[PDB]
Design a protein around this ligand. Structure first.
Ligand SMILES: CC(=O)N[C@H]1[C@H](O[C@H]2[C@H](O[C@H](C)C(=O)O)[C@@H](NC(C)=O)[C@@H]3OC[C@H]2O3)O[C@H](CO)[C@@H](O)[C@@H]1O
Lengths: 212, 225, 120, 589
């Protein structure tokens, strides 16, 4: 599972930009290398078999080529739905079928400001002894954004857990949710639970405040 | 027109050893060798095992040899992966892919069809009473603008759970919040939706919770009793 | 120990091209983000473009492709906002914003006076 | 036409042409310059002047290069990396070498550089032949020629400027080594089409042999994996005598089915090896031995290391139909260019009566730029137009350029007329050079492109070598304008032979394969024997030349031996060429 050291470990290319991902087999595996595209939460899809070959009526956007033990998967016209994790799998020896490394990158796009929403904890969730405040950053690019919680002019850390969504099939969104999970007793000790998010596409941080 | 659905849930002792059934539909199990590919959460794929029901051939990975045993039942057209002595890193999604005969293009089409995968995991999950809670649009929060409505659940043994507002007729502005990390093996999701509150006195608030394995429909409506 | 230099602006022929320079001495533009922002007199501060670590990536606003491009000079340690096919309404103050953190959260706290692009 | 240069393959071709061209001038011309400033004759050492013969006789070194696949990279890439490594080490060693002690082994190190450089040329020519697609062959040859000329320019014409200034000879040589370094890196970045059904079958057999030790099982799994990869690779390759039947012919269907069965037997053996089984694996391995004694001999079930390692390239080349016609075409295609460039310098000095410095500057600048531009333009015409027609046009233009030289000789002296005429001549020379290198790359069977390409390069150079005297005798007997008229009329036969073998050339261009003559009954073997006798006489004359050089004993009959050997060799060549034309005529009807 050791290859040559490369400065770029992941891939990020603009829409319509031809990009190539390459991996070199440890030994000769002939043309028995397949390329799979696995969108998060879904099984991998066989893009290229024989490292260059495809049947009739198949998608033609993806192409593959081999030279010696080096195999390259190239996307001619990159698309928003192309963004996924790509695995190169030599499929010569059953007992040692090897795969790729991984590629976890959002849909490369123009910079989009985060639509910051705040969801106060449910009045019936408090009955369970806990109260978690959600700060959703809907449909923003790039992934590099941060969410703080200036609860009554006091930034809160640790209890805030973030979860950037992957390529889902129900909403097709790319958002960042941060959950300031506190106990009910803590939730009664403050009035305004405001989340302040900073993004590269925001001139000023967006603060969404609610009253208890 | 073929698929490899993987299942195997039932009444089994937790913290033991379970076999993953990979039902093959649209093609006989003997015509294609079935390979179990393990994708650990956060890292890439890793071929775990394979069975060639045509000749009985079997192979495993170095990290799973001696603890796994993959079999195949041609009568019911399904494969099995009886995983024993499970360990902390044994948790992963197990996709039962297919792989054709040699010679021919079926062999070159390696893993041309996969399965949705089963998230094998080691935990202390159990069954306990659920609690459906609707996020009331409080007047104090976001006064004079758009309210933050929603609905949430606490715990469940069957993972599939669907929360919908207005029967989930909308795709924009509604964001099913992926379940927070509860270390007990249970999942607490807090489905949310940001809609204008111009229909406070007319529109009724209903949360619909759908459980596919039990065929159970749960309604959380604000109606007089 | 870090000083930001600005240039450009002034009266501009419409529909042509321009270039706004935003240099910085003592702080490498590499490993940090350097960004520009449109601001019409009657509108808000819309995004323009940002330059990330070295040549790894560059991102622009939705209404900016073709119109603008951030050219990076390693010798000068600056960010150039090249102008192209400007609309007659692109008369807007262009401000300079820097990401204070290498994590690229989007923190813009170091104030930039901002060149005054006026078109027509 | 910028798109091809934007592609990295053009860049690697250019850099490898530079790598090949760099050692040529440093080996001899720069060494002549260094000895001249030292005032040393650099003669009577008798180790020197092997550097000139090293490039000429590279076809002797070639069979080890086409036969052996280095473990690192591929055959072509590995041999290239090795050769550039030896060149870099040798140039750095000569730079380190201090003349303070004695001359020591400067001539021996120069001969080492020449051998390694002829070696690198062989490997670069082979790699360029295999890697370049058929339509890309002309443009890739053009870029390789451009890089080659640039290397000769830097090693020969920047050398004096660099040495006269502060840099000095030591730093000059180490800077040549440094400029060789990115050639090595780019060779690593170079593509590799190892291909080779013979090589894949040899890997198959080597691992099968290391598997006949199947009682340890610490090696059977890996060797069977290597066998399976080699068999899968060789299944998609094409065997000899079936290259022309590429699109799913019944013969290639039987080939593919044989490799299907073979890879199935590797499947069974690997099934038994993955079990860790000893006894079952050995029983089915004896069954595998029986099946290989029954089934898989169909396509080249033979070892690879043989005298053939050196005979097979020649055997194939001569086995091709229209082989001797192509042999003669290679010899005398560039005959007119050799005639012109042999005596251009003396003609400009005396015939048109220019000053020596004027001639030197105008040649160095205009001839070089014109050869480069003609190379590029010929290559772009090659990707536009087929090989045979482009060679036809460029040969006709070579002849008309020699006619321009006749114009120059008759016309009163003028710097501008000489400039435009020499620019036209070197333009056509560059176009013909690109087309001729493309033809050389076309002819190679790629399976062994090193040996066949080296043979064809020596074929092209043998004309040039014999051109010099005949040009001198002609100018002294008849004058310069008559000499250039005869130069045009002697560039004509190359065009004529191209027209003769146009059928073979077009067939090879369209099908990417060569017919092997089936017309041989008795005469082809007779002509082959005549050629072999000529080569043996050449070797014996070389032994006599060494004996005369050592001066222990000298026999005057060696000159007559040379003439007789040449007569017999050319007799065989013409006999084979006439047979080849007859065979083409028979295939036509
Ligand atoms: C044909 C080719 O690609 N390379 C040859 C090169 O020929 C040269 C030849 O012109 C020189 C000056 C000559 O007349 O001998 C030309 N080869 C032809 C016309 O086949 C071409 O121009 C530079 C190089 O390639 O010779 C080298 C050894 O000296 C070697 O790389 C090799 O023999």
């Amino acid at each position: 599972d050791i290859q040559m050291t490369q400065s770029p470990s992941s891939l990020s290319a603009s829409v319509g930009d031809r990009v190539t991902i390459t991996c070199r087999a440890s030994q000769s595996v002939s043309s028995a290398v397949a390329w799979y595209q696995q969108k998060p939460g879904k099984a991998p899809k066989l893009l290229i078999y024989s490292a260059s070959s495809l049947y009739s009526g198949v998608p033609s956007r993806f192409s593959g080529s081999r030279s010696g033990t080096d195999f390259t998967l190239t996307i001619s016209s990159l698309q928003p739905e192309d963004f996924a994790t790509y695995y190169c799998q030599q499929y010569l020896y059953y007992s040692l079928v090897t795969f790729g490394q991984g590629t976890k990158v959002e849909i490369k796009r123009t910079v989009a400001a985060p639509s910051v929403f705040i969801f106060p904890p449910s009045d019936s969730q408090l009955k369970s002894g806990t109260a978690s405040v959600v700060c959703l950053l809907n449909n923003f690019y790039p992934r590099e954004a941060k969410v703080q919680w200036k609860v009554d002019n006091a930034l809160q850390s640790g209890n805030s857990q973030e979860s950037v969504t992957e390529q889902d099939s129900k909403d097709s969104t790319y958002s960042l949710s941060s959950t300031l999970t506190l106990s009910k007793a803590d939730y009664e000790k403050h009035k305004v639970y405001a989340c302040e998010v900073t993004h590269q596409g925001l001139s000023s941080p967006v603060t969404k405040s609610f009253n208890r | 027109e073929v698929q490899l659905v993987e299942s195997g849930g039932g009444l089994v002792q937790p913290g033991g050893s379970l076999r993953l059934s990979c039902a093959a539909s649209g093609f006989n199990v003997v015509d294609f060798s079935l390979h179990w590919v393990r994708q650990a959460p956060g890292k890439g794929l890793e071929w775990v095992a394979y069975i060639s029901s045509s000749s009985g051939s079997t192979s495993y990975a170095d990290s799973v040899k001696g603890r796994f045993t993959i079999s195949a039942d041609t009568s019911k057209n399904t494969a099995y992966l009886q995983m024993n002595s499970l360990r902390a890193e044994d948790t992963a999604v197990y996709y039962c892919a297919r792989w054709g005969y040699w010679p021919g293009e079926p062999w070159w089409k390696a893993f041309d069809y996969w399965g949705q995968g089963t998230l094998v995991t080691v935990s202390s999950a159990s069954t306990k009473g659920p609690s459906v809670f609707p996020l009331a649009p409080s007047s104090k929060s976001t006064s004079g603008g758009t309210a933050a409505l929603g609905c949430l659940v606490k715990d469940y043994f069957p993972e599939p759970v669907t929360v919908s507002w207005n029967s989930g007729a909308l795709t924009s502005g509604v964001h099913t919040f992926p379940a927070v990390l509860q270390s007990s093996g249970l999942y607490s999701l807090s489905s949310v939706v940001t809609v204008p509150s111009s229909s406070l006195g007319t529109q009724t608030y209903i949360c619909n919770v759908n459980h596919k394995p039990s065929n159970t429909k749960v309604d959380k409506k604000v109606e007089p009793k | 120990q870090v000083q930001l230099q600005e240039s450009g602006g002034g009266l501009v022929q419409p529909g042509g091209s321009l270039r706004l320079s935003c240099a910085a001495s003592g702080r490498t533009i590499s490993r940090y983000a350097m960004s520009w922002f449109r601001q019409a007199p009657g509108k808000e501060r819309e995004f323009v473009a940002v330059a990330r670590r070295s040549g790894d990536g560059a991102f622009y606003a939705d209404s900016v492709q073709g119109r603008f491009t951030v050219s990076r000079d390693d010798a000068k340690n600056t960010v150039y906002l090249q102008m192209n096919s400007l609309k007659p309404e692109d008369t807007a103050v262009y401000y300079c914003a820097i990401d204070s953190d290498t994590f690229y959260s989007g923190s813009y706290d170091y104030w930039g006076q901002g060149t005054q692009v006026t078109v027509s | 036409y910028l798109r091809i240069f934007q592609q990295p393959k053009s860049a690697i071709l250019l850099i490898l042409g530079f790598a090949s061209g760099l050692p040529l001038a440093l080996t001899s011309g720069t060494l002549q310059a260094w000895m001249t400033v030292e005032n040393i004759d650099l003669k009577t050492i008798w180790f020197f002047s092997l550097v000139g013969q090293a490039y000429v006789f590279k076809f002797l070194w070639s069979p080890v290069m086409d036969r052996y696949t280095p473990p690192f990279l591929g055959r072509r890439r590995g041999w290239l990396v090795t050769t550039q490594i030896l060149l870099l080490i040798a140039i750095a060693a000569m730079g380190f070498l201090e003349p303070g002690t004695q001359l020591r082994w400067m001539a021996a190190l120069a001969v080492v550089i020449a051998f390694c450089s002829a070696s690198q040329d062989i490997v670069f020519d082979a790699w360029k032949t295999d890697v370049l697609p058929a339509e890309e062959r002309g443009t890739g040859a053009a870029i390789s020629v451009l890089g080659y000329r640039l290397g000769m320019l830097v090693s020969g014409g920047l050398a004096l400027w660099m040495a006269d200034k502060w840099l000095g000879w030591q730093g000059m040589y180490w800077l040549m080594a440094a400029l060789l370094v990115p050639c090595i890196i780019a060779t690593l970045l170079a593509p590799e089409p190892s291909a080779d059904l013979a090589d894949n079958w040899e890997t198959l057999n080597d691992n099968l042999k290391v598997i006949e030790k199947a009682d340890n099982a610490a090696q059977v799994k890996d060797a069977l994996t290597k066998m399976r990869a080699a068999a899968l690779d060789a299944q998609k390759a094409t065997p000899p005598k079936l290259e022309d039947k590429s699109p799913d012919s019944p013969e290639m269907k039987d080939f593919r089915h044989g490799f299907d069965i073979l890879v199935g037997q590797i499947d069974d053996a690997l099934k038994l090896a993955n079990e860790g089984k000893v006894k079952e694996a050995q029983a089915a391995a004896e069954q595998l031995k029986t099946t290989r004694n029954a089934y898989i001999q169909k396509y080249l079930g033979v070892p690879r290391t043989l005298e053939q390692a050196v005979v097979a390239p020649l055997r194939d080349f001569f086995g091709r139909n229209n082989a001797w016609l192509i042999l003669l075409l290679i010899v005398l295609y560039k005959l007119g260019d050799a005639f012109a460039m042999s005596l251009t310098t003396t003609f400009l000095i005396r015939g048109v009566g220019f000053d020596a410095g004027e001639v030197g500057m105008v040649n160095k600048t205009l001839g070089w730029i014109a050869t480069i531009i003609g190379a590029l333009y010929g290559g772009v015409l090659m990707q536009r137009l087929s090989l045979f027609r482009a060679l036809l046009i460029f040969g006709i233009l070579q002849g008309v350029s020699n006619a321009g030289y006749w114009l120059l000789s008759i016309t009163d002296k003028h710097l501008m007329s000489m400039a435009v005429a020499v620019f036209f001549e070197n333009l056509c020379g560059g176009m013909g050079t690109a087309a001729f290198v493309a033809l050389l790359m076309t002819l190679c069977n790629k399976s062994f492109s090193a040996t066949q390409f080296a043979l064809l390069s020596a074929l092209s150079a043998v004309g040039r070598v014999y051109v010099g005297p005949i040009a001198g005798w002609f100018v002294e007997a008849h004058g310069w304008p008559t000499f250039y008229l005869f130069s045009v009329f002697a560039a004509v036969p190359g065009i004529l032979l191209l027209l003769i073998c146009r059928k073979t050339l077009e067939y090879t261009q369209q099908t990417e394969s060569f017919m092997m003559r089936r017309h041989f009954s008795g005469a082809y073997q007779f002509a082959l024997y005549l050629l072999l006798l000529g080569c043996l006489l050449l070797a014996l004359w070389l032994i006599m030349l060494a004996l005369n050089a050592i001066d222990y004993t000298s026999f005057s009959f060696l000159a007559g031996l040379l003439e007789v050997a040449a007569l017999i060799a050319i007799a065989g060549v013409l006999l084979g060429a006439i047979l080849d034309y007859l065979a083409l005529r028979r295939t036509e009807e």
